[PDB]
Design a protein around this ligand. Structure first.
Ligand SMILES: *[C@@H]1O[C@H](CO)[C@@H](O[C@@H]2O[C@H](CO)[C@@H](O)[C@H](O)[C@H]2NC(C)=O)[C@H](O)[C@H]1NC(C)=O
Ligand SMILES: *[C@@H]1O[C@H](CO)[C@@H](O[C@@H]2O[C@H](CO)[C@@H](O)[C@H](O)[C@H]2NC(C)=O)[C@H](O)[C@H]1NC(C)=O
Ligand SMILES: *[C@@H]1O[C@H](CO)[C@@H](O[C@@H]2O[C@H](CO)[C@@H](O)[C@H](O)[C@H]2NC(C)=O)[C@H](O)[C@H]1NC(C)=O
Ligand SMILES: *[C@@H]1O[C@H](CO)[C@@H](O[C@@H]2O[C@H](CO)[C@@H](O)[C@H](O)[C@H]2NC(C)=O)[C@H](O)[C@H]1NC(C)=O
Ligand SMILES: *[C@@H]1O[C@H](CO)[C@@H](O)[C@H](O)[C@H]1NC(C)=O
Ligand SMILES: *[C@@H]1O[C@H](CO)[C@@H](O)[C@H](O)[C@H]1NC(C)=O
Lengths: 379, 379
């Protein structure tokens, strides 16, 4: 087994913090005082691309492929998910990603991000929502939209779905205005953080951040966002929190996170978002995987592969099958809790806290896990 | 100007008829008795691939790119739209496609298929639908879904959206059953032809093909499908028909179409579907485009380009800009009527007939064009 293991790093636009987390995890691994933890070094070959279109991601993949990576830690969006996952499976180069889960690809894709679908639907039931509007964007695909619209159709919900991509201050006013005329009181928001911040501001500019309005934020990082105004406005706001900041592992990470040079490690100036936590865990998963391969006595090597992604015929890495099988057997504790997978490479046996906004600030009102579903606190 | 022009042909799964149309148009061009029509020959370099995943489409593109094609006539689906359009724009190789329109790509993509969005929404208004279910699949993206759900949210429609991908006879029964319990009477169906045929059968097995049920079929080929049972059942069925079979141009095509050897030209056994008509027009558009380039005295050549799609830096074809600009200026008559485009490469100044199902069979009840919108017949 090699003393150095080559892995790919494929990051896209506005993922500075995630890359900072990637770098920290790798540093902590390579400088570990524990020979058992680090019998090999991780040598990342990284592309940080700002466009993230399909052509550029394909070129990045092929560049990493020719540099002989055994696996790729990679992010994608709607525009690149298909090429990246397709090239990975075709060539048996395992993809480890913190990006939105995707059912299509079923081999060579390990999806660190657990599904929010069940939790979100369970929540809507508990609250007995029947008429609400769904504000959203499509950067992370259409799964949540489809899940909501299907649940709505089977339950006689009157849901008004509205895409807010490319809305300006005017679009919103009009949007928030009409909304005002219909007297919409309940909302589910599913957007990128940047867009989320903006919508929330608009709602506050509108004065619908007061009681009694209710907002459910459909993401895994309730605490990643500033809700000060809503805490003061008095509106209901519910969300999910995958990362538990009151645990030793997260605490220890935070201890180091706060000491990072914010100029050299952009994104360290704020606490890690859930995507950054997922990225850190991804490195933990890869480290465990290579330790396992080593125990299995599988001397991973890509010699003497041509290194050409467009080679005809395609020449898939023969040891890729072992890598992929071993990845999915990983079961470790991470920033995002129990990290464990099914054969499709999807997270299973996981939990997330459910938070509500109270005067005192965010308060935990329960949790959701894939075995018990929604469990609220009660005396 | 070369006497032979190299073009790409990228066809995916179950596109036999479309390729048959492609071949016929090219044959009719190369064997034209008219020197003005054919001052050059069209030399297609074709890939007919059965999987149609992103890896295979990228490899096909690169193979055609290295064979020195000036443009590519290509089909895609949700899985390949991004790679194909991305590679085309990056390398200034114009894509001419009959596939579902896509707003993202704004250069080097000419979209032969006109939008159905306005027509469909106009239709729902005319009929004053407020409560209906939307049966659909996602092979052609989510535009129609989004358009419906947004229109619904702004108009207080109670729409129940249901995706039917991967439904079997059991899924449908349950589906059609529950539907029965809710007493759903009105439906919009937006699926692939194969899936459409199947749903329609299920509905007939259910007995909801009678009066008074209403079905709106959201596609451009009302006549492409067998509705015999519904003609007899007595249900309302409305749809759109882009190709006018009672015109000299279509008639002449049909004259030759029916004489095709159905073994050598699979798909000729039935009348051309609207996608096949679009494919034929695509060749007409390319022929006109090359005739225009010739008049402009633009001696198109890709010498001595490396021919490597993954070349760094990317070396876009310098004459690609002219090709792309000229494509979009094309204005000709085709099987699908007036073929004309805006600078985004989208169809404009087009019309489609609106058909209803009557005892006598399909009867035209009006039309929709992008200037007049919905115009119904009335005494
Ligand atoms: C605001 O959120 C509170 C959360 O407490 C909602 O009240 C809860 O509703 C659930 C389900 O209806 C009950 O099981 C809890 O007992 C309720 N808690 C309390 C303290 O009342 C409330 O419905 C929401 N109100 C609005 C206007 O959105
Ligand atoms: C869910 O995950 C936990 C680990 O986070 C699993 O608990 C472990 O189970 C093993 C047996 O396989 C015990 O030996 C360990 O002591 C447990 N660790 C704990 C409790 O921290 C649990 O088995 C998983 N449940 C599933 C997969 O159904
Ligand atoms: C079935 O379709 C017929 C189409 O004629 C519908 O009747 C038309 O409705 C439109 C708009 O309401 C009117 O402008 C036409 O004058 C109507 N035509 C006729 C002949 O009545 C009818 O509403 C549909 N019925 C059902 C049950 O779906
Ligand atoms: C819509 O398309 C038709 C062609 O199908 C255009 O009609 C032509 O207009 C030109 C002037 O540019 C006339 O010289 C031709 O005689 C017309 N051909 C016909 C009527 O068959 C029409 O201009 C287009 N309208 C638009 C683009 O607004
Ligand atoms: C050393 O690393 C191995 C593998 O990660 C682990 O089992 C062990 O607990 C570590 N030892 C210490 C002292 O942390
Ligand atoms: C010959 O082709 C040119 C260009 O397509 C066209 O303008 C002309 O009408 C054609 N002539 C005949 C007789 O069809």
């Amino acid at each position: 087994f090699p003393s150095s293991v080559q892995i790919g790093g494929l990051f896209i636009r506005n993922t500075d913090q995630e890359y900072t987390a990637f770098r920290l995890a790798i540093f902590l691994h390579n400088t570990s005082p524990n020979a058992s933890e680090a019998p090999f070094n991780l040598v990342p070959h990284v592309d940080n691309i700002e466009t993230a279109n399909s052509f550029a991601v394909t070129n990045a993949f092929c560049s990493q492929y020719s540099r002989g990576v055994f696996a790729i830690f990679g992010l994608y969006d709607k525009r690149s998910v298909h090429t990246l996952t397709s090239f990975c499976s075709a060539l048996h180069i395992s993809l480890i990603t913190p990006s939105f889960p995707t059912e299509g690809e079923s081999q060579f894709v390990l999806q660190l991000r657990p599904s929010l679908r069940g939790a979100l639907l369970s929540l809507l039931d508990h609250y007995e929502w029947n008429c609400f509007v769904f504000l959203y964007d499509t950067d992370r695909g259409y799964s949540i939209l489809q899940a909501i619209m299907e649940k709505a159709g089977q339950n006689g919900w009157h849901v008004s779905a509205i895409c807010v991509e490319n809305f300006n201050d005017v679009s919103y006013r009009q949007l928030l205005e009409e909304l005002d005329r219909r007297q919409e009181k309940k909302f589910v928001i599913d957007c990128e953080i940047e867009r989320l911040q903006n919508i929330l501001e608009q709602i506050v500019s509108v004065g619908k951040h007061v009681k009694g309005y209710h907002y459910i934020i459909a993401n895994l990082g309730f605490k990643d966002i500033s809700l000060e105004r809503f805490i003061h406005g008095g509106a209901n706001v519910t969300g999910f929190q995958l990362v538990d900041f009151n645990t030793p592992m997260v605490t220890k990470l935070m201890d180091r996170w706060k000491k990072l040079d914010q100029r050299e490690y952009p994104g360290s100036e704020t606490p890690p978002k859930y995507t950054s936590a997922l990225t850190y865990d991804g490195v933990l998963v890869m480290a465990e995987t290579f330790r396992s391969l080593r125990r299995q006595k599988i001397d991973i090597s890509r010699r003497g592969n041509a290194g050409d992604c467009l080679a005809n015929p395609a020449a898939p890495w023969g040891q890729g099958i072992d890598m992929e099988r071993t990845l999915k057997q990983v079961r470790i504790q991470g920033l995002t809790g129990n990290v464990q997978f099914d054969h499709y490479g999807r997270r299973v046996n996981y939990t997330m806290d459910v938070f509500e906004l109270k005067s005192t600030g965010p308060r935990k009102v329960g949790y959701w896990n894939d075995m018990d579903k929604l469990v609220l606190i009660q005396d």
